[PDB]
Enzyme design. Sequence first.
Site, short mmCIF file in Angstrom:
data_model
loop_
_atom_site.label_atom_id
_atom_site.label_comp_id
_atom_site.label_asym_id
_atom_site.label_seq_id
_atom_site.Cartn_x
_atom_site.Cartn_y
_atom_site.Cartn_z
CG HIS A 98 -1.93 -1.07 1.26
ND1 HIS A 98 -1.57 -1.66 2.04
CD2 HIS A 98 -3.06 -0.93 1.26
CE1 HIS A 98 -2.56 -3.34 2.01
NE2 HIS A 98 -3.66 -2.10 1.65
CG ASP B 2 1.53 -0.68 3.72
OD1 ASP B 2 0.76 -0.96 4.33
OD2 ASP B 2 1.26 -1.67 2.87
CG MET C 233 -0.79 -6.28 -6.62
SD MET C 233 -1.17 -5.49 -5.07
CE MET C 233 -1.52 -7.06 -4.20
CD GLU D 236 -8.06 -8.34 -0.94
OE1 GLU D 236 -8.10 -9.16 -0.16
OE2 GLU D 236 -7.49 -7.96 -1.61
CE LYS E 128 -12.37 -8.56 6.05
NZ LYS E 128 -11.33 -8.12 7.06
CD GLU F 108 -7.80 -12.31 2.41
OE1 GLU F 108 -7.14 -11.01 1.64
OE2 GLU F 108 -7.75 -12.46 3.58
CG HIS G 72 -11.31 -11.57 2.00
ND1 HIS G 72 -10.55 -10.74 1.65
CD2 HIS G 72 -11.13 -11.53 3.36
CE1 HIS G 72 -9.99 -9.67 2.27
NE2 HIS G 72 -10.20 -10.39 2.79
CG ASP H 110 -4.50 -11.54 -1.60
OD1 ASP H 110 -3.57 -11.15 -2.32
OD2 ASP H 110 -4.99 -10.21 -0.59
CG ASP I 254 -9.50 -10.76 7.20
OD1 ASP I 254 -9.72 -12.19 7.10
OD2 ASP I 254 -9.41 -10.22 6.70
CG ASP J 204 -6.42 -11.64 6.86
OD1 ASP J 204 -6.68 -12.05 6.60
OD2 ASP J 204 -5.63 -10.13 7.59
CG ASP K 12 -3.71 -9.88 2.46
OD1 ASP K 12 -3.07 -9.72 3.63
OD2 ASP K 12 -4.63 -9.66 2.19
O1 LIG Z 1 -4.67 -5.68 5.27
C1 LIG Z 1 -4.70 -5.40 4.12
C2 LIG Z 1 -6.03 -5.69 3.81
O2 LIG Z 1 -7.12 -5.79 4.88
C3 LIG Z 1 -6.16 -6.60 2.35
O3 LIG Z 1 -7.50 -7.72 2.54
C4 LIG Z 1 -6.00 -6.14 1.02
O4 LIG Z 1 -5.49 -7.83 -0.16
C5 LIG Z 1 -4.57 -5.30 0.99
O5 LIG Z 1 -5.90 -3.69 1.33
C6 LIG Z 1 -4.65 -5.39 -0.97
O6 LIG Z 1 -5.78 -4.57 -0.95
CO LIG Z 2 -8.17 -11.76 4.85
MG LIG Z 3 -6.61 -9.30 0.96
#
Ligand SMILES: O=C[C@H](O)[C@@H](O)[C@H](O)[C@H](O)CO
Ligand SMILES: [Co+2]
Ligand SMILES: [Mg+2]
Length: 387
Positions: A53, A56, A87, A180, A182, A216, A219, A244, A254, A256, A286
């Site tokens: 990001h 980041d 990416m 993406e 969710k 993902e 998700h 992801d 979530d 992860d 991710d």
């Molecule tokens: O913590 C990061 C996000 O929650 C993740 O799910 C996304 O993949 C990221 O923003 C990239 O788009």
């Molecule tokens: Co997630």
């Molecule tokens: Mg993600």
Amino acid sequence: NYQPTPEDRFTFGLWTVGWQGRDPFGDATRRALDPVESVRRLAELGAHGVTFHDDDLIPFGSSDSEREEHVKRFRQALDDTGMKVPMATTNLFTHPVFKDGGFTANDRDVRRYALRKTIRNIDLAVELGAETYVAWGGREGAESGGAKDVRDALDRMKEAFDLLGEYVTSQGYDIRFAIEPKPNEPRGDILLPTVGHALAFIERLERPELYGVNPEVGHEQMAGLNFPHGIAQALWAGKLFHIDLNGQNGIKYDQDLRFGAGDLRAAFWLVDLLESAGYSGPRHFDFKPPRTEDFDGVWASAAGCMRNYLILKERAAAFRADPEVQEALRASRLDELARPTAADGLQALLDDRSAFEEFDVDAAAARGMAFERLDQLAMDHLLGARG
Ligand SMILES: O=C[C@H](O)[C@@H](O)[C@H](O)[C@H](O)CO
Ligand SMILES: [Co+2]
Ligand SMILES: [Mg+2]
């Protein structure tokens, strides 16, 4: 055994190994990581590249001066290791200005600011070599039914992505967008909640060929859906631009988790699918090393991601190559599924009496599908009990 090399195309978000462990109920358990250090540590583990990001890499509120210093040292780390950046994405969720969304905030001035912040990072992404630009609208949604007119919100979401496509088109950029999905968290319900909603939405954009999905594992599993099935439909449509990979233990927050944790059999059927379909994009992780861990546990968790992919890849190849499995697949008539139902055409089908008038429904009902023996062969290969 099972050692990653850059050829396996494993990538990692800066925010993944760099997560400090602050969750809703507790403070951070690890110190902040230097992005240069993450690049070097990930290169030594065998990663293909990194993602990021904007926030980041460049701390929010940085002047044009401080911005260039942060990009410069990161670039040097890339130049020195040969790490790629396939990416990139925008942070449109952390700062309080985005508390009602970026592209679909009710306040118009916030929506224009969201677009400018995104366009700025696209320019950087393209400079660094990114081929996919990801959008996760984590703040786009509502906690209550009256807060958001969803038809108007979808107009605004379509407006923003069309404007982005006009921008990359006018600049001659060779970059594509991936949405993406969710279903919820941090909003009560998030817009475009699953892979299916995202695929349908793309087809209403002005330049649909520029947009695909970045699904993902966890998700879709937060809605209780079958992730390999949803990936199959994205591939069928020609829209799997990016993926992801992580783990999730059912319908809840979530998590992860590292890839291979959570639903292991779903991870096996996913790897079988990606490899047999010849998916050639990044294998992006991710995930979040749990906040129980120190930095040794962060790097072990990341290595575990790639290791679990490599083991599953081997088990799925052995499953498909087993002559006993190939016989099982014919006994279950998987091969008849590939045959057209009525390539003889509609008029032939209507005049074909063996398809209705003279069809023996009781004999066809009595056929066993033999699915359970096939599934137990898959189980044996996954467990290395016959591999
Ligand atoms: O913590 C990061 C996000 O929650 C993740 O799910 C996304 O993949 C990221 O923003 C990239 O788009
Ligand atoms: Co997630
Ligand atoms: Mg993600």
